[PDB]
Amino acid sequence: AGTSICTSEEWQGLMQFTLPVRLCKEIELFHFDIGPFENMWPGIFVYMVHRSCGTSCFELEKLCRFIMSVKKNYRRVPYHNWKHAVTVAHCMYAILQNNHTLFTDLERKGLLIACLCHDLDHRGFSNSYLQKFDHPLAALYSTSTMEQHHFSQTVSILQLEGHNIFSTLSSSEYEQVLEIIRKAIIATDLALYFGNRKQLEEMYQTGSLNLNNQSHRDRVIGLMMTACDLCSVTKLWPVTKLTANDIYAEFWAEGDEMKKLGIQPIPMMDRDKKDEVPQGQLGFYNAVAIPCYTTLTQILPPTEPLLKACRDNLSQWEKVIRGEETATWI
Ligand SMILES: O=[N+]([O-])c1ccc2[nH]cnc2c1
Ligand SMILES: O=[N+]([O-])c1ccc2[nH]cnc2c1
Ligand code: NI
Ligand code: NI
């Protein structure tokens, strides 16, 4: 109940944090893994905002309050947590850096914030679960149920005293950025991805795609959000495999709850069906990840390293299926 708020110690501590110099160079690369640097994650986000948007984009105090309160409103769930938030924001940073002038100052600031906030207050349950069992959230939010909640949580945090990093925008730009953030968070509903990718693929192939057309921009930003949300599949294989362990930890816990309610879960969420995981991952890469990065690379050529890495990980799941896995640690 209610929106959590960071301590004075938390945000002043972030304000005084300095990132090690060696990491500056690494943070620029798509394949960077934040995993080994947990104490640095909020600082890494500051660095990224400052480098993409400028050190004077946001009031430092308000930015640090905002970031540390965001962290406190992610739950201690296995996957949809603070680590995932920062990972997704880093992918967006890398995309923005490589495509900087295609996006406005307002878009870049909105999108980095949108990524950091896009899974706020996730409870470890899917839209499928919330709607099957008529959680109050599904009554309030008929479609894109959790994503509408994540956006509401974002607005809640911005409304905390001293947390409104967007207050200094003109009334007009303020409305525009909240709309950028809303559309971007809603776009993280994978249900909407399939239609979005199909549309973009067609606009690209026919040559009608036009980034001066707001509806096209929205769709391209949507596909960027998908690419960033799924970016664990673009890391080096050991990182991808460890992250999959966390994703499935969540899935199996939801599946367990469904069993208690008399319903057999999908195999993906069934802890007694772990043998089907490699084929399930193959399915996910073929149906979701590979097409996403394929179309993204067509539209934004600098994003090709994401696709190449995704392809390498597909090959790894294939090796698993053929019985070729080597030693893994968890
Ligand atoms: O390495 N850096 O700390 C670094 C390099 C370039 C930048 N431009 C704006 N902030 C920067 C930080
Ligand atoms: O990294 N992911 O976002 C990711 C990877 C595999 C998945 N399987 C089902 N959902 C997934 C999400
Ligand atoms: Ni989500
Ligand atoms: Ni997410």
mmCIF file of C-alpha atoms and ligand atoms in Angstrom:
data_model
loop_
_atom_site.group_PDB
_atom_site.id
_atom_site.type_symbol
_atom_site.label_atom_id
_atom_site.label_comp_id
_atom_site.label_asym_id
_atom_site.label_seq_id
_atom_site.Cartn_x
_atom_site.Cartn_y
_atom_site.Cartn_z
ATOM 1 C CA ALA A 1 0.000 0.000 0.000
ATOM 2 C CA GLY A 2 1.197 3.528 -0.904
ATOM 3 C CA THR A 3 4.278 4.758 -2.760
ATOM 4 C CA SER A 4 7.640 4.104 -1.100
ATOM 5 C CA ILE A 5 10.049 7.030 -0.638
ATOM 6 C CA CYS A 6 13.846 6.947 -0.426
ATOM 7 C CA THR A 7 15.760 8.157 2.673
ATOM 8 C CA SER A 8 17.831 11.343 2.868
ATOM 9 C CA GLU A 9 20.885 9.084 3.236
ATOM 10 C CA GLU A 10 20.007 7.184 0.070
ATOM 11 C CA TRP A 11 19.709 10.159 -2.289
ATOM 12 C CA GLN A 12 22.541 12.318 -0.883
ATOM 13 C CA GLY A 13 24.748 9.221 -1.114
ATOM 14 C CA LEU A 14 23.881 8.882 -4.806
ATOM 15 C CA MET A 15 24.590 12.587 -5.336
ATOM 16 C CA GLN A 16 28.166 12.127 -4.049
ATOM 17 C CA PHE A 17 28.779 8.853 -5.943
ATOM 18 C CA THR A 18 31.521 8.778 -8.556
ATOM 19 C CA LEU A 19 31.692 6.038 -11.205
ATOM 20 C CA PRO A 20 35.084 4.282 -11.716
ATOM 21 C CA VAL A 21 36.786 5.611 -14.886
ATOM 22 C CA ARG A 22 37.318 2.205 -16.603
ATOM 23 C CA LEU A 23 33.539 1.633 -16.744
ATOM 24 C CA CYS A 24 32.796 4.803 -18.706
ATOM 25 C CA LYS A 25 34.157 3.153 -21.853
ATOM 26 C CA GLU A 26 32.325 -0.160 -21.189
ATOM 27 C CA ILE A 27 28.907 1.414 -20.536
ATOM 28 C CA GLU A 28 28.878 2.688 -24.195
ATOM 29 C CA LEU A 29 28.765 -0.855 -25.608
ATOM 30 C CA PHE A 30 25.565 -2.826 -26.294
ATOM 31 C CA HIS A 31 26.834 -6.028 -24.653
ATOM 32 C CA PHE A 32 27.721 -4.346 -21.337
ATOM 33 C CA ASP A 33 26.402 -6.372 -18.365
ATOM 34 C CA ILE A 34 25.599 -4.347 -15.248
ATOM 35 C CA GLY A 35 25.499 -7.586 -13.234
ATOM 36 C CA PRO A 36 28.918 -7.376 -11.515
ATOM 37 C CA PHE A 37 28.406 -3.741 -10.334
ATOM 38 C CA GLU A 38 25.314 -3.722 -8.105
ATOM 39 C CA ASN A 39 26.367 -0.896 -5.718
ATOM 40 C CA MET A 40 26.957 1.243 -8.836
ATOM 41 C CA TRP A 41 23.586 0.795 -10.560
ATOM 42 C CA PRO A 42 21.920 4.092 -9.567
ATOM 43 C CA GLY A 43 25.199 5.921 -10.410
ATOM 44 C CA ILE A 44 25.301 4.208 -13.755
ATOM 45 C CA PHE A 45 21.821 5.585 -14.492
ATOM 46 C CA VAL A 46 22.921 9.103 -13.484
ATOM 47 C CA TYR A 47 25.957 8.815 -15.760
ATOM 48 C CA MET A 48 23.803 7.707 -18.631
ATOM 49 C CA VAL A 49 21.257 10.542 -18.208
ATOM 50 C CA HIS A 50 24.063 13.085 -17.889
ATOM 51 C CA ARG A 51 25.892 11.862 -20.970
ATOM 52 C CA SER A 52 22.786 11.512 -23.192
ATOM 53 C CA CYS A 53 20.794 14.504 -21.891
ATOM 54 C CA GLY A 54 23.362 16.808 -20.211
ATOM 55 C CA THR A 55 24.304 17.455 -16.578
ATOM 56 C CA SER A 56 21.785 20.353 -16.491
ATOM 57 C CA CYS A 57 18.872 18.352 -17.890
ATOM 58 C CA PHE A 58 17.483 17.674 -14.424
ATOM 59 C CA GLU A 59 18.068 19.296 -11.028
ATOM 60 C CA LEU A 60 20.581 16.905 -9.409
ATOM 61 C CA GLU A 61 18.759 16.701 -6.049
ATOM 62 C CA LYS A 62 15.399 15.904 -7.705
ATOM 63 C CA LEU A 63 17.007 13.380 -10.060
ATOM 64 C CA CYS A 64 18.704 11.531 -7.158
ATOM 65 C CA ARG A 65 15.492 11.525 -5.114
ATOM 66 C CA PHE A 66 13.601 10.259 -8.156
ATOM 67 C CA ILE A 67 16.080 7.444 -8.929
ATOM 68 C CA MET A 68 16.357 6.177 -5.350
ATOM 69 C CA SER A 69 12.571 6.254 -4.873
ATOM 70 C CA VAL A 70 12.147 4.352 -8.160
ATOM 71 C CA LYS A 71 14.520 1.676 -6.771
ATOM 72 C CA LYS A 72 12.483 1.430 -3.569
ATOM 73 C CA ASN A 73 9.274 0.780 -5.551
ATOM 74 C CA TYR A 74 10.676 -2.256 -7.340
ATOM 75 C CA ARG A 75 9.887 -5.418 -5.384
ATOM 76 C CA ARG A 76 12.265 -8.242 -4.399
ATOM 77 C CA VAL A 77 11.024 -10.560 -7.136
ATOM 78 C CA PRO A 78 13.400 -12.845 -9.066
ATOM 79 C CA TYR A 79 13.281 -11.046 -12.454
ATOM 80 C CA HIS A 80 11.020 -7.938 -12.796
ATOM 81 C CA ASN A 81 13.146 -6.045 -10.330
ATOM 82 C CA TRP A 82 15.569 -3.109 -9.950
ATOM 83 C CA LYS A 83 18.367 -4.965 -11.825
ATOM 84 C CA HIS A 84 16.025 -5.492 -14.794
ATOM 85 C CA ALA A 85 15.034 -1.768 -14.747
ATOM 86 C CA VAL A 86 18.660 -0.628 -15.022
ATOM 87 C CA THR A 87 19.496 -3.240 -17.649
ATOM 88 C CA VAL A 88 16.662 -2.052 -19.809
ATOM 89 C CA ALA A 89 17.679 1.601 -19.324
ATOM 90 C CA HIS A 90 21.237 0.773 -20.321
ATOM 91 C CA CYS A 91 20.099 -0.835 -23.580
ATOM 92 C CA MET A 92 18.100 2.317 -24.352
ATOM 93 C CA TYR A 93 21.172 4.439 -23.598
ATOM 94 C CA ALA A 94 23.241 2.404 -26.045
ATOM 95 C CA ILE A 95 20.528 2.677 -28.703
ATOM 96 C CA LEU A 96 20.210 6.467 -28.162
ATOM 97 C CA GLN A 97 24.009 7.025 -28.249
ATOM 98 C CA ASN A 98 24.270 5.204 -31.552
ATOM 99 C CA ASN A 99 21.251 7.059 -33.035
ATOM 100 C CA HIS A 100 21.449 10.304 -31.036
ATOM 101 C CA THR A 101 20.205 12.991 -33.419
ATOM 102 C CA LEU A 102 17.229 10.940 -34.643
ATOM 103 C CA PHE A 103 15.667 11.687 -31.256
ATOM 104 C CA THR A 104 14.800 14.952 -29.580
ATOM 105 C CA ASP A 105 16.136 16.067 -26.165
ATOM 106 C CA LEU A 106 12.619 15.498 -24.872
ATOM 107 C CA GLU A 107 12.457 11.958 -26.349
ATOM 108 C CA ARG A 108 15.869 10.956 -24.945
ATOM 109 C CA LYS A 109 15.075 12.131 -21.418
ATOM 110 C CA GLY A 110 11.559 10.662 -21.522
ATOM 111 C CA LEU A 111 12.780 7.292 -22.831
ATOM 112 C CA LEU A 112 15.594 6.781 -20.324
ATOM 113 C CA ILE A 113 13.167 7.557 -17.506
ATOM 114 C CA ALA A 114 10.437 5.400 -19.112
ATOM 115 C CA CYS A 115 12.890 2.447 -19.211
ATOM 116 C CA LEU A 116 13.943 2.873 -15.615
ATOM 117 C CA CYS A 117 10.234 2.957 -14.572
ATOM 118 C CA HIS A 118 8.698 0.504 -17.006
ATOM 119 C CA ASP A 119 8.177 -2.431 -14.598
ATOM 120 C CA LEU A 120 7.564 -0.398 -11.429
ATOM 121 C CA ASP A 121 5.857 -2.322 -8.593
ATOM 122 C CA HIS A 122 5.799 -5.568 -10.627
ATOM 123 C CA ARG A 123 4.610 -8.378 -8.358
ATOM 124 C CA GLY A 124 5.971 -11.314 -10.331
ATOM 125 C CA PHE A 125 2.604 -12.103 -11.964
ATOM 126 C CA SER A 126 1.725 -11.836 -15.668
ATOM 127 C CA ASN A 127 -1.195 -10.082 -17.353
ATOM 128 C CA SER A 128 -2.559 -13.566 -18.002
ATOM 129 C CA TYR A 129 -2.714 -14.269 -14.284
ATOM 130 C CA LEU A 130 -4.256 -10.928 -13.303
ATOM 131 C CA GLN A 131 -7.034 -11.245 -15.879
ATOM 132 C CA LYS A 132 -7.729 -14.976 -15.279
ATOM 133 C CA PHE A 133 -8.236 -14.335 -11.552
ATOM 134 C CA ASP A 134 -9.819 -10.855 -11.731
ATOM 135 C CA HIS A 135 -7.278 -9.030 -9.640
ATOM 136 C CA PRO A 136 -8.515 -5.487 -8.962
ATOM 137 C CA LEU A 137 -5.849 -4.214 -11.412
ATOM 138 C CA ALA A 138 -7.576 -6.029 -14.290
ATOM 139 C CA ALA A 139 -10.856 -4.332 -13.385
ATOM 140 C CA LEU A 140 -9.157 -0.943 -13.484
ATOM 141 C CA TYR A 141 -7.010 -1.647 -16.556
ATOM 142 C CA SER A 142 -8.875 -3.775 -19.067
ATOM 143 C CA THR A 143 -5.878 -4.279 -21.384
ATOM 144 C CA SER A 144 -2.060 -3.904 -20.883
ATOM 145 C CA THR A 145 -2.932 -4.343 -17.242
ATOM 146 C CA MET A 146 0.447 -4.244 -15.512
ATOM 147 C CA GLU A 147 1.845 -1.671 -17.965
ATOM 148 C CA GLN A 148 -0.958 0.759 -17.147
ATOM 149 C CA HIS A 149 -0.102 0.166 -13.510
ATOM 150 C CA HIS A 150 3.598 0.813 -14.173
ATOM 151 C CA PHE A 151 2.793 4.142 -15.759
ATOM 152 C CA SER A 152 0.504 5.071 -12.860
ATOM 153 C CA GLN A 153 3.376 4.244 -10.451
ATOM 154 C CA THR A 154 5.702 6.473 -12.438
ATOM 155 C CA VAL A 155 3.308 9.421 -12.123
ATOM 156 C CA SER A 156 2.916 8.671 -8.363
ATOM 157 C CA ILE A 157 6.701 8.933 -7.871
ATOM 158 C CA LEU A 158 6.927 12.203 -9.873
ATOM 159 C CA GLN A 159 4.222 13.620 -7.594
ATOM 160 C CA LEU A 160 6.247 13.004 -4.426
ATOM 161 C CA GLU A 161 7.605 16.173 -2.859
ATOM 162 C CA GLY A 162 10.878 17.141 -4.513
ATOM 163 C CA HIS A 163 10.734 14.254 -7.048
ATOM 164 C CA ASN A 164 9.331 16.038 -10.116
ATOM 165 C CA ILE A 165 12.291 16.033 -12.443
ATOM 166 C CA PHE A 166 10.051 17.364 -15.269
ATOM 167 C CA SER A 167 8.690 20.472 -13.527
ATOM 168 C CA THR A 168 11.087 22.798 -15.354
ATOM 169 C CA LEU A 169 9.713 21.870 -18.783
ATOM 170 C CA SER A 170 7.223 24.277 -20.372
ATOM 171 C CA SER A 171 3.604 23.265 -19.702
ATOM 172 C CA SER A 172 3.532 22.055 -23.340
ATOM 173 C CA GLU A 173 6.752 19.989 -23.182
ATOM 174 C CA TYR A 174 5.625 18.591 -19.780
ATOM 175 C CA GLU A 175 2.494 17.121 -21.376
ATOM 176 C CA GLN A 176 4.516 15.873 -24.332
ATOM 177 C CA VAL A 177 7.069 14.022 -22.193
ATOM 178 C CA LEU A 178 4.422 12.316 -20.018
ATOM 179 C CA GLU A 179 2.810 11.133 -23.232
ATOM 180 C CA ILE A 180 6.155 9.855 -24.536
ATOM 181 C CA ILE A 181 6.572 7.976 -21.245
ATOM 182 C CA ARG A 182 3.024 6.591 -21.313
ATOM 183 C CA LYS A 183 3.245 5.283 -24.876
ATOM 184 C CA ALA A 184 6.687 3.810 -24.247
ATOM 185 C CA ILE A 185 5.611 1.952 -21.088
ATOM 186 C CA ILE A 186 2.404 0.654 -22.714
ATOM 187 C CA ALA A 187 4.520 -0.536 -25.654
ATOM 188 C CA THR A 188 6.341 -2.963 -23.295
ATOM 189 C CA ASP A 189 3.196 -5.100 -23.326
ATOM 190 C CA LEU A 190 4.423 -7.915 -25.591
ATOM 191 C CA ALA A 191 0.810 -8.417 -26.708
ATOM 192 C CA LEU A 192 1.134 -5.140 -28.669
ATOM 193 C CA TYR A 193 4.622 -5.970 -29.979
ATOM 194 C CA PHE A 194 3.413 -8.526 -32.559
ATOM 195 C CA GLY A 195 1.174 -6.012 -34.338
ATOM 196 C CA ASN A 196 3.697 -3.197 -33.983
ATOM 197 C CA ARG A 197 6.553 -5.201 -35.526
ATOM 198 C CA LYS A 198 4.353 -6.398 -38.389
ATOM 199 C CA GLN A 199 3.272 -2.817 -39.170
ATOM 200 C CA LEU A 200 6.818 -1.459 -39.017
ATOM 201 C CA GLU A 201 8.088 -4.290 -41.211
ATOM 202 C CA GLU A 202 5.508 -3.336 -43.858
ATOM 203 C CA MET A 203 6.138 0.440 -43.597
ATOM 204 C CA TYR A 204 9.853 -0.311 -43.983
ATOM 205 C CA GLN A 205 9.482 -2.759 -46.897
ATOM 206 C CA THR A 206 7.093 -0.492 -48.882
ATOM 207 C CA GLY A 207 9.184 2.575 -48.078
ATOM 208 C CA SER A 208 6.308 4.488 -46.417
ATOM 209 C CA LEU A 209 8.114 4.646 -43.045
ATOM 210 C CA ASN A 210 8.587 8.315 -42.159
ATOM 211 C CA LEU A 211 10.062 9.501 -38.853
ATOM 212 C CA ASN A 212 8.552 12.987 -39.438
ATOM 213 C CA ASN A 213 5.156 11.259 -38.980
ATOM 214 C CA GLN A 214 4.288 11.141 -35.274
ATOM 215 C CA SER A 215 2.463 7.787 -35.482
ATOM 216 C CA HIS A 216 5.551 6.259 -37.143
ATOM 217 C CA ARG A 217 7.848 7.744 -34.461
ATOM 218 C CA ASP A 218 5.619 6.267 -31.763
ATOM 219 C CA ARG A 219 5.844 2.843 -33.382
ATOM 220 C CA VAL A 220 9.625 3.023 -33.798
ATOM 221 C CA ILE A 221 9.938 4.051 -30.128
ATOM 222 C CA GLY A 222 7.667 1.103 -29.261
ATOM 223 C CA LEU A 223 9.980 -1.341 -31.007
ATOM 224 C CA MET A 224 12.973 0.241 -29.231
ATOM 225 C CA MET A 225 11.137 -0.421 -25.918
ATOM 226 C CA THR A 226 10.637 -4.105 -26.877
ATOM 227 C CA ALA A 227 14.323 -4.415 -27.870
ATOM 228 C CA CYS A 228 15.471 -2.883 -24.573
ATOM 229 C CA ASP A 229 13.041 -4.925 -22.435
ATOM 230 C CA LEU A 230 14.242 -8.181 -24.028
ATOM 231 C CA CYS A 231 17.966 -7.280 -24.069
ATOM 232 C CA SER A 232 19.015 -10.089 -21.749
ATOM 233 C CA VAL A 233 18.888 -12.187 -24.934
ATOM 234 C CA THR A 234 21.598 -9.940 -26.442
ATOM 235 C CA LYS A 235 24.251 -10.444 -23.734
ATOM 236 C CA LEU A 236 27.037 -12.998 -23.753
ATOM 237 C CA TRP A 237 25.646 -16.540 -23.388
ATOM 238 C CA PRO A 238 26.517 -17.087 -19.707
ATOM 239 C CA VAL A 239 24.718 -13.859 -18.752
ATOM 240 C CA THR A 240 21.691 -14.733 -20.955
ATOM 241 C CA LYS A 241 21.520 -18.201 -19.342
ATOM 242 C CA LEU A 242 21.717 -16.899 -15.768
ATOM 243 C CA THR A 243 19.026 -14.302 -16.464
ATOM 244 C CA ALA A 244 16.798 -17.060 -17.913
ATOM 245 C CA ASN A 245 17.067 -18.821 -14.522
ATOM 246 C CA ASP A 246 15.570 -15.696 -12.879
ATOM 247 C CA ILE A 247 12.777 -15.302 -15.470
ATOM 248 C CA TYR A 248 11.769 -18.947 -14.949
ATOM 249 C CA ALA A 249 11.905 -18.625 -11.134
ATOM 250 C CA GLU A 250 9.063 -16.098 -11.535
ATOM 251 C CA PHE A 251 7.204 -18.175 -14.084
ATOM 252 C CA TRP A 252 7.246 -21.305 -11.902
ATOM 253 C CA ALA A 253 5.975 -19.369 -8.863
ATOM 254 C CA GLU A 254 2.979 -18.111 -10.895
ATOM 255 C CA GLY A 255 2.371 -21.648 -12.212
ATOM 256 C CA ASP A 256 2.359 -22.890 -8.611
ATOM 257 C CA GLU A 257 -0.392 -20.402 -7.693
ATOM 258 C CA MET A 258 -2.522 -21.465 -10.661
ATOM 259 C CA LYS A 259 -2.287 -25.110 -9.523
ATOM 260 C CA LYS A 260 -3.664 -24.032 -6.141
ATOM 261 C CA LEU A 261 -6.605 -22.469 -8.019
ATOM 262 C CA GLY A 262 -7.385 -25.741 -9.852
ATOM 263 C CA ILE A 263 -5.861 -24.682 -13.205
ATOM 264 C CA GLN A 264 -2.933 -26.429 -14.935
ATOM 265 C CA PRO A 265 -0.418 -23.724 -15.926
ATOM 266 C CA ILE A 266 1.107 -23.426 -19.403
ATOM 267 C CA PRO A 267 4.226 -25.624 -19.629
ATOM 268 C CA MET A 268 6.422 -22.531 -19.469
ATOM 269 C CA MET A 269 5.173 -21.819 -15.929
ATOM 270 C CA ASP A 270 5.228 -25.459 -14.774
ATOM 271 C CA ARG A 271 8.232 -26.302 -12.518
ATOM 272 C CA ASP A 272 7.552 -29.986 -13.230
ATOM 273 C CA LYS A 273 8.158 -29.373 -16.920
ATOM 274 C CA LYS A 274 11.704 -27.962 -16.963
ATOM 275 C CA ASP A 275 12.592 -30.408 -19.787
ATOM 276 C CA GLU A 276 10.527 -28.256 -22.170
ATOM 277 C CA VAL A 277 12.497 -25.049 -21.400
ATOM 278 C CA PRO A 278 15.021 -25.286 -24.267
ATOM 279 C CA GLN A 279 12.282 -25.772 -26.894
ATOM 280 C CA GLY A 280 10.302 -22.954 -25.197
ATOM 281 C CA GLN A 281 13.277 -20.621 -25.503
ATOM 282 C CA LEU A 282 13.713 -21.618 -29.165
ATOM 283 C CA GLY A 283 10.050 -20.685 -29.643
ATOM 284 C CA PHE A 284 10.484 -17.337 -27.920
ATOM 285 C CA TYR A 285 13.578 -16.418 -30.004
ATOM 286 C CA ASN A 286 11.972 -17.458 -33.283
ATOM 287 C CA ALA A 287 8.601 -15.769 -32.638
ATOM 288 C CA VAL A 288 9.599 -12.689 -30.604
ATOM 289 C CA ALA A 289 13.306 -11.859 -30.149
ATOM 290 C CA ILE A 290 14.804 -12.528 -33.565
ATOM 291 C CA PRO A 291 12.055 -10.688 -35.515
ATOM 292 C CA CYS A 292 12.251 -7.751 -33.066
ATOM 293 C CA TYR A 293 15.996 -7.220 -33.538
ATOM 294 C CA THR A 294 15.743 -7.967 -37.257
ATOM 295 C CA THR A 295 13.251 -5.144 -37.878
ATOM 296 C CA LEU A 296 15.024 -2.852 -35.401
ATOM 297 C CA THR A 297 18.327 -3.305 -37.334
ATOM 298 C CA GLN A 298 16.570 -2.507 -40.615
ATOM 299 C CA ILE A 299 15.175 0.748 -39.220
ATOM 300 C CA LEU A 300 18.217 1.695 -37.105
ATOM 301 C CA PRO A 301 21.297 0.117 -38.703
ATOM 302 C CA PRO A 302 23.660 0.916 -35.722
ATOM 303 C CA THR A 303 21.602 -1.496 -33.591
ATOM 304 C CA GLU A 304 22.896 -4.510 -35.577
ATOM 305 C CA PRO A 305 25.073 -5.750 -32.648
ATOM 306 C CA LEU A 306 21.857 -6.598 -30.749
ATOM 307 C CA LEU A 307 20.670 -8.823 -33.569
ATOM 308 C CA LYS A 308 24.045 -10.553 -34.022
ATOM 309 C CA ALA A 309 24.125 -11.362 -30.273
ATOM 310 C CA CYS A 310 20.502 -12.531 -30.270
ATOM 311 C CA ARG A 311 21.371 -14.864 -33.172
ATOM 312 C CA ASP A 312 24.385 -16.203 -31.220
ATOM 313 C CA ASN A 313 22.095 -17.004 -28.259
ATOM 314 C CA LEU A 314 19.556 -18.749 -30.454
ATOM 315 C CA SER A 315 22.448 -20.944 -31.627
ATOM 316 C CA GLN A 316 23.246 -21.691 -27.967
ATOM 317 C CA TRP A 317 19.681 -22.827 -27.183
ATOM 318 C CA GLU A 318 19.914 -24.999 -30.299
ATOM 319 C CA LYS A 319 23.121 -26.575 -28.887
ATOM 320 C CA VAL A 320 21.272 -27.250 -25.653
ATOM 321 C CA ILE A 321 18.550 -29.077 -27.597
ATOM 322 C CA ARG A 322 21.160 -31.172 -29.476
ATOM 323 C CA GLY A 323 22.682 -32.235 -26.109
ATOM 324 C CA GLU A 324 25.864 -30.168 -26.467
ATOM 325 C CA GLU A 325 25.612 -27.959 -23.315
ATOM 326 C CA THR A 326 28.806 -27.565 -21.267
ATOM 327 C CA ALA A 327 29.127 -26.775 -17.529
ATOM 328 C CA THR A 328 26.811 -24.052 -16.224
ATOM 329 C CA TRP A 329 26.802 -22.315 -12.825
ATOM 330 C CA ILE A 330 23.690 -20.784 -11.239
HETATM 331 O O1 LIG B 1 33.841 9.402 -19.892
HETATM 332 N N1 LIG B 1 33.101 10.268 -19.433
HETATM 333 O O2 LIG B 1 33.023 10.410 -18.216
HETATM 334 C C1 LIG B 1 32.387 11.079 -20.237
HETATM 335 C C2 LIG B 1 32.704 11.231 -21.592
HETATM 336 C C3 LIG B 1 31.984 12.087 -22.423
HETATM 337 C C4 LIG B 1 30.929 12.775 -21.829
HETATM 338 N N2 LIG B 1 30.053 13.658 -22.341
HETATM 339 C C5 LIG B 1 29.217 14.047 -21.352
HETATM 340 N N3 LIG B 1 29.553 13.417 -20.210
HETATM 341 C C6 LIG B 1 30.608 12.625 -20.482
HETATM 342 C C7 LIG B 1 31.326 11.773 -19.651
HETATM 343 O O1 LIG B 2 14.973 -11.676 -21.705
HETATM 344 N N1 LIG B 2 13.755 -11.683 -21.836
HETATM 345 O O2 LIG B 2 13.153 -10.615 -21.824
HETATM 346 C C1 LIG B 2 13.099 -12.854 -21.974
HETATM 347 C C2 LIG B 2 13.818 -14.002 -22.328
HETATM 348 C C3 LIG B 2 13.209 -15.243 -22.474
HETATM 349 C C4 LIG B 2 11.834 -15.277 -22.248
HETATM 350 N N2 LIG B 2 10.968 -16.305 -22.321
HETATM 351 C C5 LIG B 2 9.737 -15.830 -22.026
HETATM 352 N N3 LIG B 2 9.808 -14.508 -21.765
HETATM 353 C C6 LIG B 2 11.101 -14.136 -21.902
HETATM 354 C C7 LIG B 2 11.715 -12.890 -21.749
HETATM 355 NI NI NI B 3 6.704 -5.484 -18.125
HETATM 356 NI NI NI B 4 10.421 -5.399 -18.420
#
